[PDB]
């Protein structure tokens, strides 16, 4: 994860968005953060989607992931506030590549596109 700027409405929402972003990153520090009883095969032994299992596990408990993700210094920038593993915002420290914006972030729009013979969609 190079950078992430969240603009959640609530602290709980901020935590949920960060967890989703960390899981989507697939960073090794998050895979190693998996702890306790997590199964990637159901009772029928079918193979579940690992991303969904990780997302569910980390949404159930994110304390370990936040603790092991890592911390970095914050470059003072107007409107950007860091966030710490204990969820309390900070101005000097923050999670690695994580920022919180209080002014909002911009929005859905459909764009016409051209598709060639080999199904390669281009703008």
């Amino acid at each position: 994860l190079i950078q992430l700027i969240v603009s959640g409405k609530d602290e709980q929402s901020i935590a949920e968005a960060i967890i989703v972003a960390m899981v989507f990153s697939q960073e090794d520090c998050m895979i190693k953060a998996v702890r306790g009883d997590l199964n990637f095969v159901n009772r029928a032994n079918q193979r579940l989607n690992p991303m969904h299992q990780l997302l569910r596990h980390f949404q159930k408990d994110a304390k370990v992931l936040f603790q092991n993700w890592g911390i970095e210094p914050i470059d003072n920038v107007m409107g950007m506030i860091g966030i710490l593993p204990d969820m309390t915002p900070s101005t000097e420290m923050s999670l690695r590549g994580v920022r919180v914006s209080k002014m909002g972030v911009d929005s859905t729009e459909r764009v016409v596109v051209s598709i060639d013979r080999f199904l390669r969609v281009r703008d």
Binding site: E16, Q59, D106, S107
Partner: peptide
């Protein structure tokens, strides 16, 4: 600027 999130399958953290 309240907005939806399309498909979703997640619960709340603790």
């Amino acid at each position: 600027a309240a907005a939806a999130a399309a498909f979703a399958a997640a619960a709340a953290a603790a």
